[PDB]
């Protein structure tokens with residue numbers, strides 16, 4: 221099996237990350253990378269704690285961890301989070317001053333974030349860091365982008381195959397969002413991984429109740445059920461994210477909420493570092509109750525006690541949907557995730573697909589639209605449908621205790637209300 225962490229390892233976790241213990245799969249990955257120096261492909265679900273797997277090992281041994289990712293604003297967010305935890309880190313690119321390069325060469329930075337493009341164009345730097353400081357691990361986030369069948373293919377990822385040539389002694393952790401075998405096979409081949417440890421957290425978030433409801437024709441009438449009149453004003457029942465498919469719909473939703481004097485903020489791709497910091501401050505401290513968002517990552521919506529998620533409009537696809545609802549209930553307490561949709565929603569509109577150029581991509585949008593619509597229309601357990609997608613296999617109901625109970629999803633709750641059976645075994 222896997223040996224337990226030692227005292228020094230647990231002390232370092234507490235000192236720098238604020239956690240009393242590792243989660244099981246975090247430990248499997250960290251032990252494998254840190255103590256067995258083994259390549260890893262790790263599938264980690266929402267809010268499990270994926271970042272610890274590449275941030276912890278270089279902090280523990282005092283060397284460099286290289287993190288490769290296309291998501292620049294997210295890397296900036298992570299650098300700030302690390303700095304606030306007394307861990308030095310930086311985002312290294314072309315614009316960087318000469319002096320930051322010398323600081324990295326002297327080992328100032330425990331975690332170095334780079335884009336795929338920067339990484340591919342500076343292998344000599346990495347070899348110098350490897351020889352002078354030592355690289356504990358290379359983390360490739362979004363590693364599915366190196367696959368054509370990963371549907372987010374990035375040509376910038378193709379040249380990551382040189383990593384194992386240039387740095388044969390350095391273990392690579394590849395992080396991906398589903399347990400798909402065809403994606404895993406492409407990651408292993410394109411990253412030249414050697415006998416990697418494969419791990420999967422599984423995907424369930426049992427404290428997230430799932431519900432789907434049709435739009436009624438007016439924004440306030442749609443959102444009213446989620447509101448409570450505390451004497452003198454309206455409020456959401458608790459902290460809420462409303463996901464919208466476009467900035468235009470975001471502005472529509474925001475205008476209606478301001479008719480009720482509800483405190484809210486918006487959250488979009490492209491917001492400055494200072495803007496994302498300010499939203500993070502206001503949301504965490506509950507100075508705004510609701511964030512209306514067109515993106516599902518970044519510090520702005522990083523809050524432990526989000527009680528309600530509302531998709532205002534059909535979600536884009538199962539993967540975006542899962543990541544979006546996963547921002548809810550990070551504290552483990554009960555939360556709800558509601559989709560409000562109509563057949564006319566833009567994410568269900570096949571007539572918008574006629575003008576996209578790539579046939580293989582358009583067939584994917586078609587299949588994903590079809591899958592999302594089938595989910596939204598279903599009378600069956602919502603949680604089973606989602607879990608089956610991410611496991612890449614039919615998940616059977618009652619492989620999990622939440623499934624089939626009143627808190628599982630609207631369709632399970634309805635079947636129980638209509639004299640259904642409660643699966644004592």
Ligand SMILES: Nc1ncnc2c1ncn2[C@@H]1O[C@H](COP(=O)(O)OP(=O)(O)O)[C@@H](O)[C@H]1O
Pocket residue numbers: 239240241242243246264265266267268269270271272550
């Ligand atoms: N070992 C741990 N014990 C408790 N909480 C943890 C642990 N590791 C990570 N977390 C928490 O998990 C949450 C999600 O971490 P994050 O890096 O956002 O995960 P992801 O990016 O996988 O959603 C954060 O609240 C983080 O503090």
Ligand SMILES: [Cl-]
Pocket residue numbers: 465532533534564565566567
């Ligand atoms: Cl829509």
